[PDB]
Amino acid sequence: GSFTMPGLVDSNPAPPESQEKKPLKPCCASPETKKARDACIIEKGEEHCGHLIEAHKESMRALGFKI
């Protein structure tokens, strides 16, 4: 409500559709974050996918051996 300036304004688009994930493998990995890494490295490259690094480092924080 009423005018407000940049950085204190919700200037985001609407959120995306959710879909299913692949299962695990018989050794500990995240094959979905691997697929998403490989695809983001195709779309932009390693030094431009910091959100995907965040997702996979916090995915291995879920195993307690990364950060």
- For residues 38 and 56, what is the distance between their CA atoms, to the nearest angstrom? 12
Report the structure determination method. NMR
Place of tokens 């932009």: 44
CATH number at residue 53: 1.10.287.1130
Nearest Cα neighbor of 56 from 38, 12, 13 is 38
Place of tokens 């890494």: 37
According to DSSP, residue 15 is labeled P
Q: Which are the contacts of 33, defined by CB distance < 8 A and separation ≥ 6? A: 52, 55, 56, 59
Binding residues: 27-28
Instruction: For residue 56, give the H/E element and its range.
Output: helix 50-61
Whole domain around residue 22: which residue ranges? 1-67
Task: Report how many domains make up the chain.
Answer: 1
Binding residues for Cu cation: 27-28
